[PDB]
Structure formats: C-alpha cells, structure tokens
Symmetry: C2
Subunit: 59 residues, 2 copies
C-alpha cells in the first residue's frame, strides 16, 4: 500500500513538474515574441520619422 | 503705403514660415527620440526574456 501510493505520487509530481516547465517556456517565448514585435513597430516608426526629418532638411 | 504694407506682410510671412519650419523639425526630433527610447526598452526586456529562457533550457 505504501509503495503503490508513493510511486503514484512520484509520477503525479513528475507530471506537474513537466506541465509547469512547459508553461514557463511558453510564457518566456510569448514575452520574447511580444518584445520582438515592439522592436519592429518602433524601428518602423523611427524610420518613417527619420525620412520625414530628411525631407524637412531640404524643404 | 502699398509698399510698406507689402514689405511688412512679406517679412511677417517669412517669420511664420521660419517658426513653423522649426516646429516641424522639433516634432520630428521628438517622435524620433520617443521611438528610440521604445527600442531601448523593448531590446532590454527582450534580452531579459532571452536570458530567462536560456536558464530554463538548463533548469
């Protein structure tokens, strides 16, 4: 009785560990991707503004 | 009378043109700088997230 309970509880803990490890990696990748998109957005608007500034420097 | 009125109106228009040109350059530079700051912020958080992901890939 002790054995089957202990073994089962070990496997159940292992399963939670694996799920939570996957959740951590998922959340990291999500945050990474959102920041990459923010960089693309800002570099884009920075370039638009750079070009407008250059067109002003003429007239 | 016509001359002094015309001359004065020309100079006044020139003055507005110069003020407005400066305003345009000011607004461009302001937008440029805000986007540069957004890039610095996001690259920073992207790097923090990258490092956390690497620390997960071990454990």
């Amino acid at each position: 009785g002790s054995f089957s309970r202990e073994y089962t509880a070990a496997v159940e803990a292992k399963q939670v560990a694996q799920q939570e490890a996957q959740r951590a990696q998922f959340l990291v990748e999500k945050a990474k991707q959102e920041q990459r998109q923010k960089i693309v957005q800002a570099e884009g608007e920075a370039e638009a503004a750079k070009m407008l500034g250059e067109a002003l420097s003429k007239n």
